[PDB]
Amino acid sequence: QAIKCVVVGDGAVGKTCLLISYTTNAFPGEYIPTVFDNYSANVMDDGKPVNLGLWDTAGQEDYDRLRPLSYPQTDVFLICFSLVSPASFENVRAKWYPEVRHHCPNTPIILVGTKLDLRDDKDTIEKLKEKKLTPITYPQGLAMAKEIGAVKYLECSALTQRGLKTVFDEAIRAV
Numbered sequence: 001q002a003i004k005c006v007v008v009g010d011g012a013v014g015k016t017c018l019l020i021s022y023t024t025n026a027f028p029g030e031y032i033p034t035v036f037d038n039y040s041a042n043v044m045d046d047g048k049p050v051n052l053g054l055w056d057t058a059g060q061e062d063y064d065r066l067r068p069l070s071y072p073q074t075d076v077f078l079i080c081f082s083l084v085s086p087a088s089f090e091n092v093r094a095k096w097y098p099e100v101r102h103h104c105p106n107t108p109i110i111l112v113g114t115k116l117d118l119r120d121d122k123d124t125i126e127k128l129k130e131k132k133l134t135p136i137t138y139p140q141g142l143a144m145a146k147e148i149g150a151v152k153y154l155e156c157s158a159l160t161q162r163g164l165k166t167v168f169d170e171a172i173r174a175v
């Protein structure tokens with residue numbers, strides 16, 4: 001059957017690269033599509049075939065009025081945040097969880113930390129330290145996942161593809 005999965009989260013957390021890296025097995029290097037689109041994947045999981053529909057969204061505030069038009073008939077949401085952006089992590093509960101629950105009270109949510117490959121990057125750490133900030137640790141994300149009652153907390157990197165298949169694998173299992 002068909003599953004509708006919608007991806008939301010701050011601008012430049014990597015939502016488009018997340019979707020493109022998953023469906024093509026390739027990270028787009030300077031070639032990131034600018035057209036907001038929905039993608040697809042036919043996958044085998046636990047025995048049955050599945051048509052997973054993936055809906056990208058514009059995460060900037062300029063789209064707050066239009067973005068929810070993609071929400072009807074959603075089966076599962078992915079709320080994304082950059083593991084190396086505390087502001088994006090904060091916006092999970094400041095913006096994204098409220099907005100999702102406001103329109104879709106009972107749809108399961110998957111909390112996804114993105115850009116896992118940057119959590120150990122010396123330059124990213126030092127730049128964050130200039131703001132007295134630190135990358136989001138796994139226990140941090142887990143706790144956030146439990147605060148908003150997400151069915152699962154998962155971390156991934158669209159660049160290395162580490163932990164990327166699990167994200168969409170678990171979003172199907174959530175449905």
Ligand SMILES: Nc1nc2c(ncn2[C@@H]2O[C@H](COP(=O)(O)OP(=O)(O)O)[C@@H](O)[C@H]2O)c(=O)[nH]1
Binds near residue numbers: 012
């Ligand atoms: N290092 C790293 N950079 C990433 C990753 N995913 C996305 N990016 C970068 O983050 C930027 C925004 O990605 P994009 O998918 O457009 O985010 P969106 O605005 O949420 O769609 C791009 O400049 C990518 O180079 C990742 O897993 N690792």
Ligand SMILES: [Mg+2]
Binds near residue numbers: 015016017056057
């Ligand atoms: Mg995008």
